């Protein structure tokens, strides 16, 4: 597949508020959150990946093996736990987060020199796009 490794700076963040509200994030935390511009710092070696979502407020760190279900601790976001699997779908990464909220997960892929992220929960869609600083 491809190598997602890089420091990717946020360019686009669409519908983040609705996504966070669907996760029952409280108004105060939602308020500070949509002023953040979280970046993605990714390091990958084959199926082993660390995805760090970095913001000035709080970070969220994912560390996993593609194909292997793990207990995902979403402290800092909605403080839930999911039974999560990230899978290859050709050159895209497809993540299913099993738990309280239905249809929760995301897709990550590269189009040209842009990193694209679609986050989903309960039919709510948030679009994020990032680029490395050339």
Ligand X SMILES: CC1=C(/C=C/C(C)=C/C=C/C(C)=C\CO)C(C)(C)CCC1
List of residues contacting ligand X (CB under 6 A): 20, 25, 33, 36, 38, 51, 53, 55, 57-58, 60, 62, 76-77, 106, 119
As a whole number of angstroms, the distance between CA 25 and CA 78 comes to 6
Whether 134 contacts 11, CB under 8 Å = no
29 sits near Na ion (criterion: CB under 5 A): no
* Contacted entry of Na ion, ligand X, none for residue 106, CB cut-off 5 to 8 Å set by kind: ligand X
Residue with tokens 């290859």: 88
Strand partners, 118: 107, 127
Nearest to 57 by CA among 100, 83, 25: 25
Per-residue contact string for residues 55-94; x = within reach of Na ion by CB under 5 A: xx--------------------------------------
Judged by beta carbon distances under 5 to 8 A according to partner kind, the member of Na ion, ligand X, none in contact with residue 56 is Na ion
């Amino acid at each position: 597949p491809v190598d997602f490794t890089g420091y990717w700076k946020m360019l686009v963040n669409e519908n983040f508020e609705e996504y966070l509200r669907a996760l029952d994030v409280n108004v105060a935390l939602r308020k500070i959150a949509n002023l953040l511009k979280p970046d993605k710092e990714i390091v990958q070696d084959g199926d082993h990946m660390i995805i760090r979502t970095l913001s000035t407020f709080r970070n969220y760190i994912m560390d996993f093996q593609v194909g292997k279900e793990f207990e995902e601790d979403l402290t800092g976001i909605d403080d839930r736990k999911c039974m999560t699997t990230v899978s290859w779908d050709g050159d895209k990464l497809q993540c299913v987060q099993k738990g309280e909220k239905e249809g929760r997960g995301w897709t990550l892929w590269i189009e040209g020199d842009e990193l694209h992220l679609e986050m989903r929960v309960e039919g709510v869609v948030c679009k994020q796009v990032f680029k490395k600083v050339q």
